[PDB]
């Protein structure tokens, strides 16, 4: 079962957290969007039944946790995360309070587009939404103009025998009311100050990670 995250109790701590995100979003000429935005690809193109060999369905209970988390972010109760710059990684995301195992961290957001319209895109943060048999139907999330914390989260080096030991969250795709949705979930208990890491190549192997720390 998905768990709702625990926002920091001090309002000044939540402001400092939102501040680090606003700052990193600014340096990237980005606006804040905690939703998928649909020009490029219409909302009507996002159908989970189009996924090759199907897409797991998010349960009523888990949709309720997702909606609760979404309502928390809307009122100022962001997850306890800090966007911190790193000499070796660029912008990174660290836990700024405890994050229990199975906790919903965030949804991977940005403009939804057809993979075909982004074949020559330099965005270091593109994420697959829908993988259909028809390549003209495959979708991707593009946080180049608007996004949230998800795009700043680090990935593991898939080439080294020990970089999997750094992984503390997992990216998953679930069908939510018939649409593909991309979520980040803590795979273990994460302490204050731990940097967040997931596998950028959880399904396809379309992300070069050989030079990652």
């Amino acid at each position: 079962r998905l768990l709702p995250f625990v926002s920091s109790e001090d309002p000044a701590q939540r402001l400092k957290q939102m501040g680090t995100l606003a700052s990193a979003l600014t340096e990237l000429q980005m606006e804040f969007s905690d939703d998928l935005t649909y020009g490029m690809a219409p909302r009507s193109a996002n159908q989970a039944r189009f996924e090759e060999g199907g897409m797991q369905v998010l349960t009523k209970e888990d949709i309720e946790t997702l909606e609760q988390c979404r309502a928390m972010c809307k009122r100022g109760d962001c997850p306890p995360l800090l966007v911190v710059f790193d000499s070796r990684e660029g912008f990174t995301v660290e836990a700024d309070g405890q994050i229990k195992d199975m906790t919903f961290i965030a949804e991977y957001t940005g403009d939804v587009d057809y993979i075909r319209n982004r074949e020559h895109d330099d965005c270091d943060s593109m994420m697959t939404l829908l993988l259909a048999k028809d390549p003209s139907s495959s979708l991707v999330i593009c946080p180049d103009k608007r996004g949230n914390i998800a795009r700043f989260i680090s990935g593991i080096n898939n080439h080294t025998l020990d970089a999997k030991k750094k992984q503390n969250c997992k990216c998953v795709r679930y069908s939510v009311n018939g649409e593909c949705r991309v979520f980040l979930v803590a795979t273990r208990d994460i302490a204050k100050g731990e940097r967040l890491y997931y596998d950028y190549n959880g399904y396809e192997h379309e992300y070069p990670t050989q030079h990652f720390v």
Binding site: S125, T128, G155, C171, Y203
Partner: peptide
């Protein structure tokens, strides 16, 4: 070539 991240659609968390 574009380099985007990928996540599974089966197997849960």
């Amino acid at each position: 070539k574009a380099a985007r991240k990928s996540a599974p659609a089966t197997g849960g968390v």
